[PDB]
Design a binder for these strands. Structure first.
Ligand code: SFG
Ligand code: SFG
Lengths: 239, 249
RNA sequence: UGGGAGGUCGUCUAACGGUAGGACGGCGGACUCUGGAUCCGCUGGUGGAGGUUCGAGUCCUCCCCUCCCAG
């Protein structure tokens, strides 16, 4: 299974994944364990200070190095041999399914969540192994990015289960009723012949990947069949 | 004052406490700057056992969300929102979110966010009820709730009064299309790493230029593509050239 | 190191020839809303010697240092 350490000022936010859905069930079955450490518990003053103003002035607050460092060492300690420390940040490697598959190898990870204007550069230099971004946009804190990462990798823990399965966008899906607001379910889905249906769905994934996200298409090495189905799909669009 | 309304359809509305009860966004909610209402398809399920999923035609992996509870929750939300309510489906097949897209979404006063579960939702509900599809990235999650919260948070940073200092909004990556410069705070020396002297000089102009040059250097080194097609200034051009030079030596 | 211009807390900016203030910064404390915070204090300057004057940040001389205009 998998163990995840989180350093965050709002550990209760993590209940969002540790108590609901697939991940909640994973936690209940001891397949996934998530432990949180809060830098505030590492302060030594009445107001539990974990941040201050960035030098050179100007607006904003930066998190202080010491509570985070102490929290990280505590986590690393109670983590064992070889825990990799990742900092969530928009300046890090942009996360994608390949990165997710790579991340799913580590048995233990510690995730550092920023707030306000960020964290001290020296903490990044001295304690962080890798930086990961969930996308080219900026959030108010690292807790959501951390939960996103945790969820994406959790879809791999053995015994818990599929877009990008083959590098392609998923195909369209249908359920009851047979007719919805005048829209009928594709007759092919009703033939009951599993093979004709599979080929239809695959053609659909190719068509969808090609239209909405053609760049995803550039790197793949398609089977003869996939190339054929995509060309067939291509013929209908320009007609 | 300013204000935004977000309607959410999700089987696990309690997850949203993560943003409505914590940090800047939680405060935004407390100050009535941001309002979030959550409708749960389970409250719409007729089924005695309150079944919210259903089988996909054609078999295979997964279950799909059952059409009636979900459709009905959406109709209720659209009904509460009135006009100007744009409906977005969070899905990996949607438009990949970036800071430009965030600025675009932030132009809406009302949004309804549909969070999928299981293998997703019936395609016909997407065609008939969804206005736009959005992805937070090229990776797959167990549900649309995290994506939804992400979208809300990213856009929330643009509502006036959410951050309290409006200049903070710009002092982040992608704000002006460049990555942020590195930051330092107290104490001045910690475990042998010293704070760069310019930041302690009290010399405002040198500090402004240092911060700007650093932002440029970092962008060039990590994400040079952002630089492509950017419209600098003479000063920025000068600082960048200096940075490209200095980095090599 | 040739011809102009100019030197005030670290930076920015004030002061009649009458005792040098302010903003930002930095440091120190509080702060039962961790707040992209707030509040209260402390720190700190006329580049250097001469002369004029009852008195010089200010006027005069020299020296030193800095910016602009071909080294
Ligand atoms: N795109 C993102 N991917 C991962 N984490 C993010 C992302 N955007 C923000 N965060 C987290 O949110 C925290 C607070 C941010 N406002 C700080 C941003 C920081 N000034 C920067 O530009 O890198 C960051 O420290 C990260 O922990
Ligand atoms: N990258 C993403 N961007 C936006 N929403 C996502 C993303 N990944 C998962 N989701 C949400 O999670 C839901 C259920 C997913 N487990 C499976 C989705 C399914 N692959 C599809 O074709 O939509 C998706 O329908 C979305 O609501």
């Amino acid at each position: 299974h998998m163990w995840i350490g989180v350093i965050s000022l709002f550990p209760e936010m993590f209940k969002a994944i540790t108590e609901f859905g697939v991940t909640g069930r994973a936690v209940k079955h001891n397949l996934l364990k998530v432990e949180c450490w809060n830098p505030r518990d590492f302060t030594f003053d009445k107001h539990k200070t974990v941040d201050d103003r960035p030098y050179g002035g100007g607006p904003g607050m930066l998190m202080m190095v010491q509570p985070l460092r102490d929290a990280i060492h505590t986590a690393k300690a109670a983590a064992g041999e070889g825990a990799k420390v990742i900092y969530l940040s928009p300046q890090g490697r942009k996360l994608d399914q390949g990165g997710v598959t790579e991340l799913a190898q580590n048995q233990k990870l510690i995730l550092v969540c920023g707030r306000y204007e960020g964290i001290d550069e020296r903490l990044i230099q001295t304690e962080i192994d890798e930086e990961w971004s969930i996308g080219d946009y900026v959030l108010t804190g690292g807790e959501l990015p951390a939960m996103t990462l945790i969820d994406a990798v959790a879809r791999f823990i053995p015994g818990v289960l599929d877009s990008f399965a083959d590098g392609l966008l998923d195909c369209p899906h249908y359920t009851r009723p047979e007719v919805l607001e005048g829209l009928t379910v594709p007759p092919v889905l009703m033939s009951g012949h599993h093979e004709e249906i599979r080929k239809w769905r695959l053609k659909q994934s190719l068509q969808r990947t090609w239209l909405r996200r053609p760049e995803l298409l550039e790197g793949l090495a398609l089977t003869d069949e996939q190339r054929k189905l995509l060309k067939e799909a291509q013929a209908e669009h320009n007609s």
